[model samples]
Target chain A: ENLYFQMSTLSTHILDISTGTPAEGVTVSLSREGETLANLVTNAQGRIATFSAAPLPAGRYCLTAETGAWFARAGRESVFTRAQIDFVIDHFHLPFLIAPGGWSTYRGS
Target chain B: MSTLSTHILDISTGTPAEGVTVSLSREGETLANLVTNAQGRIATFSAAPLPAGRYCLTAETGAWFARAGRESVFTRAQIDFVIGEDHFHLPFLIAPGGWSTYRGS
Candidate 1:
């Protein structure tokens, strides 16, 4: 059976899509199924806490990252929006997915 | 005048993702949240008086399928972005096994 490996370094990044800068203080979480695995906060450089573990088994997992609400609602009309990206942990690297409401996962290096 | 917006597409079926729950947070706190419309768009987030900082966005992918009485490989998702003086547009393209995001105009 394929066993999931713990990632040696789990880094989460939040970018200022408008300026491409580091989005600091963003809350990120990793999970297996509905169970919470780890909770993290991004640094001033827009990268979240890093972990040291092995790779996850060839299965499905959820990696969720969010920017603070203040930034999403930083407009006159309280313009709030959320982006969600789903991915499968395969052997190949995946690309990040984005959309108006959310994003999906792909092969990333 | 600067605003924020989002769009969701279900790559599994190649159609706009409608009725997905969206939540916004700051410092791990919930601020505003809503659901996508028929066009798979949030239209607008009621966050006026733009601030000069960062924010977090989240979606309940599992609940989206739960509403339809089905189970999906994904249960939830979240993405973080920053806010500046310029209008920001972030898009999400989601699939069962993969997803992607990018800055928009």
Candidate 2:
């Protein structure tokens, strides 16, 4: 007897606000109800690994992206800035969208 | 009539965030200080007079969440908006790990 594979997948896309180019090397992490599920960095094209967690547990989740480094000049320490976005992960395929200084995520087919 | 006001909501919990501290500054200088109300809305500097120029609004997210026994990744939210005679409503939906903001009527 052969077994069949059935699973649901989710996709996401991130864009750079300063240049509209793909934000590369940015870390994207997913969490459910405050628990982390996945953490990965974007590629040169600002793409992360596809997620295949179907019937996603009903809970709230947050996705965050961080880039750049902390720099200090003179006598003051510079702060590192990052962008964060949150959305609900329900039992459906969703597309997570993020941008620099802003982000939005919604239910997707 | 500062011509600017703000409101905060914790979308994660679907409720208003009250007692959150906020600071307003102009030209990189501190101008006023305030706190949120029961509805997570500011009561001071509402429709107050403000000079026409650029301004920065900072929210003490860290202390705010700490007071509620919650930890947030965003310790503060610094937003810059242009101020004029026009009424401005800057609303924010904040959480421990993330937040969202937009211009409102």
Candidate 3:
């Protein structure tokens, strides 16, 4: 296995705009090059401070949030089934602010 | 008085998404139609300050991606909010498979 040894870490947060609160218990999954890296759920504050157990290599990655199911569970309607962010990582912090009708993510500090 | 502004960022490529058409509407009536600038920003929606009311900002996401030869699941992105006072900066961060927006500064 060829691993390009540059190490990096990732963190994420989710905020529900509709409810004006953190989106607790939302599942966020991380993948790289078609392989699953880790799966985590948002905490009470809607944050995942440590997303991966192992240091991530510099490459393309995706963090997929199960947004539709989350809205469905609350009996709300949403446009996207899931929200995925495809990014090149290096100590990244991605935050998502979501509503039933609309949602958004950004490159955070 | 209230004002609305928006920016588009393509998270997939980590660059500002330019040329995306954006429209502002209130209760099914189109207020202003504009396009993103080089920085993927639309600074002003209307000449006059927007009054207190419910408004929706819609972005032509699918068309923009189509022009760039990228496949996206969403045809459009819409944000509905009530305008009370001050400035509203809403930005859309989009990808091929998913997209999101937020109340920004």
Candidate 4:
């Protein structure tokens, strides 16, 4: 068939600026068309190793991060309580660098 | 400090973004929508405080710049957040090709 799934990957890293370290144990999920395809948690390095890391199609996908609970546990108030990224998936690596007062995201290799 | 105030700054012009529309929504229902004041900030957020749940704060970046005869890749910038007992501020730093958001004081 002309249309087939190719080996692709979706992953994210959560950097907690407040502690000047990675926000480990935070949860993240990969979803498409309202269906959750994968769910994972940040490791010691605050990285989502994979939620399947399966071949994917070119379309829209979302990565939702649980930054609120992550910080709340540490007894700190994180301004941006939640974080999500919706992007066109043509094969990409994404990261969320979150601080107590700010966050930045960008397309990564 | 209001429960959930916001500020929109135009980094391209290095000035506060006034006359921009900001909307606070939960799930898919819009809770409140207000326009930025001269200082590019909301007068107040919620009268009381927001409960714990999902939220979406949006900015009318495209229209704000369109009024001045400019265009930006960022049209409506939305920040999805979770509310707790503490007060929070959502400020946006935006440019034509890139933008940033964070939990503000």
TM-score of chain B of each: 0.84, 0.88, 0.96, 0.91
On a 0 to 100 scale, what is the lDDT of residue B96 in model 2? 65
Runs of candidate 2 with Cα error greater than 4 angstroms are A1-109, B43-47
**True-vs-predicted CA distance for residue B6, candidate 2, Å:** 0.8
Give residue A82's error in model 1 in angstroms.
32
Estimate, for each residue in B6-103, the C-alpha lDDT of model 1 and write its tens digit.
88876544577798888878788777798888888886675575565677878776677678665556677788977655566666666544455677
Best by lDDT: 3
Clashes of 4: 3
True contacts kept of 3: 0.00
Native A-B interface contacts kept, per candidate: 0.00, 0.00, 0.00, 0.00
lDDT of candidate 4 at residue A92, scale 0 to 100:
65
TM-score of each: 0.47, 0.52, 0.52, 0.49
In terms of docking quality, model 2 is incorrect
Rank the candidate models, highest lDDT first: 3, 4, 2, 1
Candidate 1 local lDDT, residue A25: 58
Residue lDDT tens for model 3, A1-109: 2211118888999987544578997888888899877788889999988766777788999998888898889886666788999998557889987766556788988
Q: Which of the CAPRI classes, incorrect, acceptable, medium or high, describes model 4?
A: incorrect
Enumerate clash totals for all models, in the order shown.
72, 6, 4, 3
